[PDB]
Design brief:
The structure is cut from a larger assembly and holds chains A (71 residues), B (116 residues) and C (177 residues). Chain A has 71 residues and is mostly beta strands. Chain A has a single domain, classed as OB fold (Dihydrolipoamide Acetyltransferase, E2P) (Beta Barrel), CATH 2.40.50.100. Chain A has no helices and 6 strands. Chain A has a 3-stranded antiparallel sheet with strand order 1-4-3, with no helix packed on it. A 3-stranded mixed sheet of chain A has the order 2-6-5, with no helix packed on it. Chain C has a single domain, classed as Ribosomal protein L5 (50s Ribosomal Protein L5, Chain: A, 2-Layer Sandwich). Classes of the chains: A mainly beta (71), B alpha+beta (116), C alpha+beta (177). The chains hardly touch. The structure holds 3 RNA strands. Chain A: This is Large ribosomal subunit protein bL27.
Chain lengths: 71, 116, 177
RNA sequence: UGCCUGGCGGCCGUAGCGCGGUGGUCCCACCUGACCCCAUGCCGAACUCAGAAGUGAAACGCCGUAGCGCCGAUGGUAGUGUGGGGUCUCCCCAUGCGAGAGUAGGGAACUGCCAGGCA
RNA sequence: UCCUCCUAAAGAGUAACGGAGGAGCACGAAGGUUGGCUAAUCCUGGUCGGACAUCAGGAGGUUAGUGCAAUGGCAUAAGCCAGCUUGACUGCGAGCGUGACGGCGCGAGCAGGUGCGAAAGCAGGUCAUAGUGAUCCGGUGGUUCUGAAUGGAAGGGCCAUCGCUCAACGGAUAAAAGGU
RNA sequence: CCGAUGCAAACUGCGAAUACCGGAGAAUGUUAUCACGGGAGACACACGGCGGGUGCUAACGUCCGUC
């Protein structure tokens, strides 16, 4: 005895995010990609096709999943 | 821990095929009987299922579980798929090894003219 | 195979008569025997460990695998991954033959043969014991002895209590304590 | 159409943890030997070849045990947006939204499709 | 110059030489893919080993680890044995998240050709968050693209690109350094 | 160190109000919304209320987010 990075959710549930849009950019893996959602090298979730976003809880561990469904 | 490990290992392909959302052919192997099922992408319905136990195909088979039975099941699955219009389903090994009866069944199914 | 039939004929029958069981295989069965060396004196020299592994392979029907260290502590002056010893697993005809030959020739001829220590149990049925002077085993000759080394023989036991293990040991009359 | 067994999905502790009983009709389970397809970072450990010759040991389906664990109310409590007041560091007033835990209650799950045995 | 949690009032952002250090490296294997495996921690048995130099029966299931100081998520391990390779290749690339710009990051998908497989499919470096170089200057190879009449040559214009601790790291004119 | 009672900025098996993103909706608001072009103007703000940091949780001291 710097420049802060921009975190948080950019598009929330109900947004008509089109293909290529990134849903959230988090440090680690806060949420896991579900249907029609891809995960990048830097632990970033992005959409693969047009649709409405949704967040769901499933699995023995009760893990949060980000999914996209047809509008 | 054998069945749990088998399920865990099969879960890899089980989830992998989900993203592409294509009909899947799964095989359950047991010395007593062999089962083959065609499952739709939604995963809650089966297009067609065959079992070595059924007499319809066990009449000509000396024993329910063997290479000949696997080949017969493969042929039956292939012809049913051809007459139903599966449109080139994918397949999963269900965590088994593709060297014995699984390979024989796959070859028998492909012999009909499938493109999986 | 060779001894399994006799075991079923005699030991299983005796245990069933003694304990009034129902299932034919209610009596616990031995699955595998693990031969290990607890010498722990091959740190300085690797040729000692190599010769010990060769002796293990010669006595057994299969060669051993070298095992590395698990944790590193400054108290005992040990690093991580340091090869010290090896183990052999026997399950099947080889295991039956090895057990038969042992109980036939090796066990009777032991110096200070005060009997097996039944108290040396894991608390659930598995029995592990070690003895010195591998020269007792006929598979090793006096002309090819480098040093005195101990053994560690552990038998698999599926029982849920020590009474079953004691009965299994008494199956061969358990000469004495 | 009813009982039992195996597989494919949803539900993910109202599905779990501990205890007693039952399951060989069918199904499932222990695999003996492997010089033969397959191989061990040693081991036929797993996988592959022949079933009732040996049985339900362990695993798993079901009933009860509400013992542990979970959810779960109405109500209250702590807090806060808005305007005002006081002894203004903090609190109160009219109004809206409303904690956690626990109590009543529940459950030893349920549900959709396919294969087999007994009816 | 850049990262790591708070103060920072549950989107982002939001202070004072604020509280805190680390990186300016490294792996051309620590990269890709197929099979299987996956604890740590503690009790009990071994010649000593008692837990602590190795082995097997249990308590318990992600408390060990993930190249780094630290950080989040990670048992479908994002680890760890057996095998083969270089997809860390080339032209690219709709769109999205940031910005004042210079620009930065992710990114579905096509084509030319490859590795992992029987296939489904993965491979545009490393689990990630820092780990570097912009303008100008000097050097290499291609282009008749251009060439002050003609045919060349010299010199420029663009393509991959080394040096430039340029480590004053957006880098102020050609102006050498230390002090009472 | 074994179990428990209370506590926390680099503590959450739980979890507000409040803020913010999208969809639908009766009504008001001189389109008050967004796109392009011309013209500018300003680039030491002060104080107060609300919740904090700093300060010796002494200071009509200091800096923040909102009105």
């Amino acid at each position: 005895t710097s420049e802060a990075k921009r975190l948080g959710v950019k598009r929330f549930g109900g947004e008509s995010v089109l293909a290529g849009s990134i849903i959230v950019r988090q440090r680690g893996t806060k949420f896991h990609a579900g249907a029609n959602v891809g995960c990048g090298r830097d632990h970033t979730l992005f959409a693969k096709a047009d649709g409405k976003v949704k967040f769901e809880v499933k699995g023995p561990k009760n893990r949060k999943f980000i999914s996209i469904e047809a509008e | 821990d054998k069945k749990s490990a088998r399920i865990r290992r099969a879960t890899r392909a089980r989830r992998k095929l989900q993203e592409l959302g294509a009909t899947r052919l799964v095989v359950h192997r047991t010395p007593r009987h062999i089962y083959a099922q065609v499952i739709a992408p939604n995963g809650s319905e089966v297009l067609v299922a065959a079992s070595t136990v059924e007499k319809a195909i066990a009449e000509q088979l000396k024993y329910t579980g063997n290479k000949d039975a696997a080949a017969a099941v493969g042929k039956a699955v292939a012809e049913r798929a051809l007459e139903k219009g599966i449109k080139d389903v994918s397949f999963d090994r269900s965590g088994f090894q593709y060297h014995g009866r699984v390979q024989a069944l796959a070859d028998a199914a492909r012999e009909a003219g499938l493109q999986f | 195979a060779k001894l399994h039939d006799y075991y079923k004929d005699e030991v299983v029958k005796k245990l069933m008569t003694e304990f009034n069981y129902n299932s034919v295989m209610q009596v616990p069965r031995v699955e595998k025997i693990t031969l290990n060396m607890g010498v722990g004196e091959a740190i300085a020299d690797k040729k000692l460990l190599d010769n010990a592994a060769a002796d293990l392979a010669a006595i057994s029907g299969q060669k051993p695998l070298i095992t590395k260290a698990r944790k590193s502590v400054a108290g005992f002056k040990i690093r991580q991954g340091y090869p010290i010893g090896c183990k052999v697993t026997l399950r099947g005809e080889r295991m039956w033959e090895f057990f038969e030959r042992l109980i036939t020739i090796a066990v009777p001829r032991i110096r200070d043969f005060r009997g097996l220590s039944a108290k040396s149990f894991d608390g659930r049925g598995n029995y592990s014991m070690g003895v010195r002077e591998q020269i007792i085993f006929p598979e090793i000759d006096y002309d090819k002895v480098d040093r005195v080394r101990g053994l560690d023989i552990t038998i698999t036991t599926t029982a849920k209590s020590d009474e079953e293990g004691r009965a299994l040991l008494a199956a061969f009359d358990f000469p004495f304590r």
